[PDB]
Ligand binder design. Structure first.
Ligand SMILES: CC(=O)N[C@@H]1[C@@H](O[C@@H]2OC(C(=O)O)=C[C@H](O)[C@H]2O)[C@@H](O)[C@@H](CO)O[C@H]1O
Length: 377
């Protein structure tokens, strides 16, 4: 039921690895070909994650060799501090360096991940009690802003905390997670994309977005980041409240899935066929659902209900958005959207979409849970 889907992904990945060389895929832009970069964006780690997933499934060394090469690329990126002045250090190094340590216990990868965790830690603003999303410290407009995406970048810190025994990692991680729950999540279980606090004291100011339709809409990927993100912090912290929030945001998402099973880019715009979609949001959510389920009690009937929703979602992605390995297609799933309001790849492949789509398949077929935490933790 999942072998066929995985099969096409494996084939597409093998071809890409040869085609791309040492370059990294980000998103497509009006075609079945990925636009590449020299490891300079926030999405580069997803390529690494895909390669490590393919290796774990097949045992095929060509995948492992490609992943190892990206790790070397990440060491260079880190020791040069190239475009890392943001919170996405987690997405970047959890799926690359920490991934290798999770897969084969490579001490060298472990240290790199730890090195990367230290840099991310210096993004914490004591006065505001948050981890700054974008820009250098004190940035006039972003110095006190947090984003729901950041929840997915906390696993790197939490993992490092357990690795080093340094309590500060978990302290700042839990604090930021709770702050996010109070201000980014809304009363109807929906969510804001970003939230602003007073840099001087950390007082709440306002919620808002630059990727969602309006400050008060629900950017589906934002919601997705929340679902999976809160569930991941929930696991590390053993926080029943964060888990509850994950489930709330999940149920909200599920009740707004359109007919073909894959969501539009924002829940608060007309849910019409001519509107852009965001397959990546559905992909992230499928993983979120499985993570939540994995934390529930067996007697919890909602557990199987989430697993089934995750399956239905992956199946929906497979039947309507997945690319068959036709020798040309470079992406796993179509119709992802990067920045709709901005006009940037609103109907294309997204490397993160591809990663979560595969992680979902690996979770469902082999019980392989990705690289957010140690296997068996
Ligand atoms: C480093 C940075 O700020 N990059 C911008 C992008 O931000 C990323 O967006 C997403 C996403 O899911 O789309 C996830 C990351 O958490 C976040 O840092 C994004 O805003 C993009 C839109 O055009 O612009 C980049 O500059």
């Amino acid at each position: 039921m999942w072998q066929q889907a995985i099969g096409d992904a494996l084939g597409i990945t093998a071809r890409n690895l040869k085609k791309f060389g040492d370059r990294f895929p980000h998103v497509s832009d009006g075609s079945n070909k990925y636009v590449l970069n020299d490891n300079t964006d926030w999405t580069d780690g997803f390529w690494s994650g895909i390669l490590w997933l393919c290796y774990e499934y097949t045992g095929d060394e060509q995948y492992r060799e490609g992943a190892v090469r990206t790790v070397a690329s990440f060491r260079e990126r880190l020791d040069r501090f190239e475009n890392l002045d943001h919170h996405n250090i987690g997405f970047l190094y959890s799926l690359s360096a920490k991934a290798q340590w999770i897969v084969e216990k490579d001490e060298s990868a472990r240290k790199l991940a730890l090195d990367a965790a230290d840099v991310l830690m210096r993004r914490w603003r004591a006065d505001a009690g948050i981890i700054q999303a974008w820009g250098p410290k004190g940035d006039p407009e972003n110095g006190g802003r947090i984003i729901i995406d950041c929840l997915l970048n906390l696993p790197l810190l939490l993992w490092a905390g357990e690795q080093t025994g340094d309590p500060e990692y978990r302290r700042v991680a839990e604090a930021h997670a709770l702050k996010s729950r109070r201000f980014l999540v809304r009363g109807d279980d929906s969510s804001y994309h970003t939230f602003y606090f007073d840099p001087e004291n950390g007082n709440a100011i306002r919620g808002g977005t630059h990727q969602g339709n309006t400050d008060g809409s629900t950017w589906t990927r934002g919601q997705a980041w929340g679902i999976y993100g809160f569930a991941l912090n929930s696991r590390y912290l053993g926080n029943a409240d964060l888990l509850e929030t994950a489930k709330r945001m999940a149920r909200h998402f599920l009740a707004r899935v359109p007919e073909d099973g894959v969501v539009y880019w924002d829940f608060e715009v007309p849910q019409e066929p001519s509107s852009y979609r965001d397959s990546s949001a559905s992909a992230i959510t499928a993983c979120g659902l499985l993570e939540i389920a994995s934390q529930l009690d067996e007697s919890d009937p909602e557990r199987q209900r989430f697993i089934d929703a995750a399956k239905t979602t992956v199946t929906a992605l497979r039947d309507g958005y997945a690319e068959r390995d036709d020798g040309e297609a470079e992406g796993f799933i179509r119709r992802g959207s990067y920045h709709v309001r901005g006009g940037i790849s609103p109907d294309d492949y997204t490397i993160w979409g591809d990663y979560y789509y595969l992680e979902a398949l690996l979770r469902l077929e082999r019980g392989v849970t990705g690289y957010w935490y140690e296997r068996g933790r």
